[PDB]
Amino acid sequence: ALWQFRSMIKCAIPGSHPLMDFNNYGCYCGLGGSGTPVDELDRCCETHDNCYRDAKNLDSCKFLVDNPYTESYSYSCSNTEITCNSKNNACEAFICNCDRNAAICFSKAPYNKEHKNLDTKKYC
Ligand SMILES: [Ca+2]
Secondary structure, X not given: OHHHHOOOHHHHOOOOOOOOOOOOOOOOOOOOOOOOOOOHHHHHHHHHHHOOHHHOOOOOOOOOOOOOOOOOOOOOOOOOXXXXXXXXXXXXXXXXXXXXXXXXXXXXXXXXXXXXXXXXOOOO
16 A cells, blocks of 8 residues: 555654655656656655556456555564564555565665656656
8 A cells, every 4th residue: 555655764764755755766666657766765765656557467467457555564663673463364465565675675775865856858
């Protein structure tokens, strides 16, 4: 889940907005655009998209029409670090693993907060 990993993405960035620091960014990070990224940090948004979807195809969730931003969450928060859920059928918990390893790219990665604010021309 996207709003539900976006409580804890503001624990992840002590920080401010969970996305919008990402929505626009290098190309598209988390929300906005489409194509390929720029940063190591923007790569976990090519896959918070490419491992985010696949609930739609899932071994554990056979149904078509999940929507790429929706399924999981039952979390936490510490210093800046959470957990994900406390139940696990892949329907939620597979999507929850894509969300938290993106909270880890997004809190930390080989980050650069530098190509914010952008466009997709120079950028994508
Ligand atoms: Ca995107």
